[PDB]
């Protein structure tokens with residue numbers, strides 16, 4: 039990790055001086071949710087380029103009455119960021135006073151029961167880069183954030199998932215809310231058929247390229263975490279299919295679901311403990 | 313990636329000035345195929361050491377009436393190369409005007425139906441280093457080569473595999489041509505029993521230490537790809553076996569198969585699209 | 587790898603000139619075995635800071651009559667060491683004249699038949715970082731240590747494991763000695779439920795964060811290898827459990843087991859070929 043403890047403190051102190059807002063919730067907007075900052079009131083925006091130590095914009099504002107800090111644009115391993123840069127904002131959030139992190143992403147559906155446009159609550163994850171030691175916590179532990187060996191078995195808050203199921207029901211959507219396991223791999227290529235079959239056999243329901251390292255750092259520093267995937271495509275599972283994953287369809291799925299995603303997150307603000 | 317687009321251009325230009333050959337086919341010769349360059353007519357040879365930006369020798373020549381460029385010797389992750397070095401030649405090939413890449417390798421047989429000396433057409437792959445983000449495409453995307461998120465589900469050209477089956481028949485070899493999934497891992501050690509069992513349970517038929525990153529880059533830049541593995545050993549699947557994988561047996565299998573592999577590739581030239 | 591053959595040689599020379607002891611056994615003490623040096627007679631201690639090229643202390647002394655060199659403190663990937671630093675001592679031991687390496691660790695129990703406090707003999711391993719090329723042998727091969735492609739299928743000496751079972755039975759312990767496959771991942775976080783389930787389905791019995799690199803380098807240089815894990819916790823396998831892995835209970839389990847682990851290793855010395 040290239041950052042010192044004091045880097046995170048300096049960045050938090052800088053933000054705290056430059057805004058009077060004091061959010062308890064941070065939201066990292068993945069695909070389909072880039073427009074969520076447009077639902078904020080009393081919005082104050084900082085370009086990442088103007089914030090000390092930041093590797094896009096960070097927006098402080100109020101979402102459905104709740105003070106939030108939002109990343110419009112996140113960082114990815116596939117773009118060449120190390121995980122200690124990808125996750126820098128999460129520790130800054132903790133030092134700002136945030137207590138809950140909401141994460142979202144786009145993902146391919148491995149579970150054959152999913153459909154394009156589904157929302158999948160993340161109940162759990164599989165961190166494939168972590169199996170080989172690629173991990174934002176690699177290196178000396180900063181005890182001022184958390185412990186050397188943090189547990190991940192309770193990462194995705196149970197109460198929030200129950201409340202998300204309730205909220206969804208009250209929104210009266212025809213399509214049910216999905217829930218399952220998100221597997222992170224590095225990307226940026228999409229998977230072969232053989233890779234898709236094995237990922238599904240690992241127990242995964244959705245595959246993507248982000249989120250997990252953010253969650254690990256969030257849990258290490260004691261944040262409550264809730265997340266979901268937008269299912270943008272059903273991954274190709276056989277050789278006979280003329281289907282082929284492509285950015286175009288992912289972008290189009292994101293566009294079609296944007297309103298539903300934003301609405302759902304906005305409504306969920308009410309369920310986050312104060 | 314330490315190379316700029318202009319680095320690839322410089323190397324392509326250097327080669328195009330040093331030879332008047334204009335190949336449509338590139339062959340990366342894996343174990344057992346090192347002698348293929350000796351079958352070329354009107355061969356012109358360049359040591360890797362002399363070629364600008366190259367991390368063996370590169371040979372331009374005619375094989376069975378088709379103009380080829382051929383890597384005698386390739387680069388491996390286990391020798392300490394990053395994938396952006398391993399795959400440098402593939403993008404150069406595209407800039408030379410190559411349209412089809414033939415790749416080969418040696419591999420251990422995970423499928424118990426394989427025998428030493430079998431050729432396995434590669435129908436698909438599993439990229440284990442890519443699960444952790446070790447990927448030649450990591451970093452900012454070069455759009456002059458291809459898209460940010462390239463698909464891999466159709467990587468191994470279906471027509472070529474059909475024509476390879478037909479070509480093998482024409483050869484009257486008594487051993488059938490195999491076809492299956494190659495899994496790449498870093499190496500250089502051979503697998504434990506527990507590792508072999510889990511790799512077979514992932515759906516892999518053969519295990520090796522190369523090829524996949526070159527295929528990813530090839531597909532990203534639009535090349536047609538055909539590949540195969542020489543099965544040099546049946547991997548050890550139980551603790552009771554007195555068998556043990558060893559380089560000597562791998563070298564011996566390559567020697568015994570060399571003529572058949574060279575003949576197969578030569579004959580396959582007639583089936584590569586023009 | 588930052589070390590040349592001469593660096594290892596220099597380090598070995600230096601140790602050989604600074605002690606008269608000529609150990610044939612090396613012990614890398616994992617969790618629970620830190621106190622084993624206290625059972626050494628005629629002990630001479632070198633701080634790692636004293637030894638040329640070393641990335642804790644190295645203790646030469648006599649264990650149950652048998653000359654040993656023991657690492658009190660090993661190096662871990664999760665603390666930011668590359669595997670070429672983690673495994674540096676193993677090659678030094680070979681150049682000292684060591685013929686047998688004993689390794690130990692703490693691990694989480696994936697096999698539901700295990701209980702906290704169990705000792706699991708390592709019959710085999712799964713090297714997940716090695717699947718992505720994170721391997722202490724990556725780079726140019728040094729033939730003076732071993733071959734380019736060393737086999738791992740016979741890594742854990744069969745005779746030593748049989749003798750360990752006999753020793754345990756003669757100790758009269760009522761809990762049986764376990765035996766199985768250890769899977770290494772990077773850490774330092776503990777696993778999610780989904781990860782635990784998939785690792786069990788890979789065929790692993792215990793999961794930890796060390797050892798495997800040391801074993802690969804040991805086998806590459808021809809050392810006999812024996813190892814075990816102390817099972818410090820039963821990994822969480824379902825979402826209904828209120829359990830949660832924690833360092834406090836791992837430390838406590840090691841503390842409780844220490845006197846027995848030290849006794850077991852001490853008695854096992856008699857079973858090493860002389």
Ligand SMILES: Nc1nc2c(CCCCC(F)(F)P(=O)(O)O)c[nH]c2c(=O)[nH]1
Nearest residue numbers: 068069143144145146245246247248283
């Ligand atoms: N590996 C993989 N990833 C995806 C994705 C996610 C593509 C990248 C998403 C993103 F930009 F990283 P995020 O920030 O997670 O929304 C969609 N469909 C698939 C898919 O089929 N496979």
Ligand SMILES: Nc1nc2c(CCCCC(F)(F)P(=O)(O)O)c[nH]c2c(=O)[nH]1
Nearest residue numbers: 342343417418419420519520521522544
């Ligand atoms: N992982 C693994 N690799 C192999 C191999 C391939 C050895 C290396 C081949 C090579 F040099 F990398 P290539 O360039 O792919 O021909 C033969 N048998 C086995 C085997 O049993 N396991």
Ligand SMILES: Nc1nc2c(CCCCC(F)(F)P(=O)(O)O)c[nH]c2c(=O)[nH]1
Nearest residue numbers: 616617691692693694793794795796831
């Ligand atoms: N991945 C993983 N590791 C562990 C451990 C090992 C913790 C670290 C041990 C160590 F310090 F690295 P060692 O040198 O191997 O004793 C205990 N329980 C679990 C567990 O449940 N999961």
Ligand SMILES: [Mg+2]
Nearest residue numbers: 044045048091
């Ligand atoms: Mg600073």
Ligand SMILES: [Mg+2]
Nearest residue numbers: 151152214216
């Ligand atoms: Mg359903």
Ligand SMILES: [Mg+2]
Nearest residue numbers: 425426488490
């Ligand atoms: Mg057959």
